[PDB]
Design a binder for this molecule. Structure first.
Ligand SMILES: NC(=O)c1ccc[n+]([C@@H]2O[C@H](COP(=O)([O-])OP(=O)(O)OC[C@H]3O[C@@H](n4cnc5c(N)ncnc54)[C@H](OP(=O)(O)O)[C@@H]3O)[C@@H](O)[C@H]2O)c1
Ligand SMILES: O=C(O)[C@@H]1CCCN(S(=O)(=O)c2ccc3ccccc3c2)C1
Length: 305
């Protein structure tokens, strides 16, 4: 189960999310990534931010070297950090991510966020010049596909309307779940053959640096719980399955053996139209990442409602 991107490459519709907070040792990323691939995840999501590209690359290479998968059955993503928006900085950051991971190429490179930062407080950078630079990475074969993350609709339109555009973004990876379902943005992405990829699809890690602990816990929601009991699955599985039936590619982070295996069960059952409607009724503009440290950035994405 893959979707065709708008540049003719294929992305598997379920991905493994690799971020863990700095309190978790680096070494854990190697082990869970292996477990992920072993349970059947073929889409692995990382970034320069995560400080785990070496372990995620090792895990991938190890599962190739033990014969379980070829390179080409793995879809590996990484992301350009926000200090590296000036265009001359883009290929070197990708080359850097490739060497940490000890791979020849990434299946996908994303701009991690539109909120540019001084290299190395906010920066002002024409993100069309960043994008041109992402295109040259694809033309060089350093990334199979290129995309954006944390763009709102108007920020997407800016790239799509660029003079001399060579490659549209293949996807926009944004926060997306039953409390913040992004359906207007999803409709716009669909009208342009851009894949929406959902992060914090299970309600996020609730890290105190960015998430108010008073916020409702997505996986305690009573409608997801009732649906879980109706289907004899789990609330995580319902949140995951909702995204696939809306045409959304979904990430799922877990560092626990049993949850990793449970999550691939999303392929084994269906929700009804009435189920999908009950879930669409939970939407309440709740973006779990909600911090003073970005909220007044000039290109804050949630300034467009
Ligand atoms: N582009 C961006 O700016 C951005 C932002 C956020 C995240 N991401 C990407 O998205 C990935 C996923 O999002 P996320 O990190 O926010 O976490 P998430 O996918 O919402 O997961 C939330 C928590 O759910 C738990 N979980 C997973 N499966 C479960 C299950 N079956 N039952 C109950 N708990 C379960 C995990 O805890 P356990 O580990 O204990 O199982 C995890 O800490 C990230 O790791 C990263 O790759 C990108
Ligand atoms: O990609 C991930 O998993 C990271 C998790 C923790 C930090 N973030 S991040 O790039 O600093 C970040 C922080 C705050 C944000 C607020 C609104 C939207 C995106 C954000 C990304 C991404």
């Amino acid at each position: 189960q893959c979707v065709k991107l708008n540049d003719g490459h294929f992305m598997p519709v379920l991905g493994f999310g690799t971020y863990a907070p700095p309190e978790v040792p680096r070494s854990k990323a190697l082990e869970v990534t292996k477990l992920a691939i072993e349970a059947g995840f073929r889409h692995i999501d990382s970034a320069h931010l995560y400080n785990n590209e070496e372990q995620v690359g090792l895990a991938i290479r190890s599962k190739i070297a033990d014969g379980s998968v070829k390179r080409e059955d793995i879809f590996y993503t990484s992301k350009l950090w926000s200090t590296f928006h000036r265009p001359e900085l883009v290929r070197p950051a990708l080359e850097n991510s490739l060497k940490k991971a000890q791979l020849d190429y990434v299946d996908l490179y994303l701009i991690h966020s539109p909120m540019s930062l001084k290299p190395g407080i906010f920066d002002i950078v024409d993100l069309c010049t960043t994008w041109e630079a992402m295109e040259k990475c694809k033309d060089a074969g350093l990334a199979k596909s290129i995309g954006v993350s944390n763009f709102n609709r108007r920020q997407l339109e800016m790239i799509l309307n660029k003079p001399g555009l060579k490659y549209k973004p293949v996807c926009n990876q944004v926060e997306c779940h039953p409390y913040f379902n992004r359906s207007k943005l999803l409709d716009f992405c669909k009208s342009k053959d851009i894949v929406l990829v959902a992060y914090s699809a299970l309600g996020s890690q609730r890290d105190k640096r960015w998430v108010d602990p008073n916020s409702p816990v997505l996986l305690e929601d009573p409608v997801l719980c009732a649906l879980a009991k109706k289907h004899k699955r789990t609330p995580a599985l319902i949140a995951l399955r909702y995204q696939l039936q809306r045409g959304v590619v979904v990430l799922a982070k877990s560092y626990n053996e049993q949850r990793i295996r449970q999550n691939v069960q999303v392929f084994e059952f269906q929700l009804t139209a009435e189920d999908m409607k009950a879930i669409d009724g939970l939407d309440r503009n709740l973006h779990y990442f909600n911090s003073d440290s970005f909220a007044s950035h000039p290109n804050y994405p949630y300034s467009d409602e």
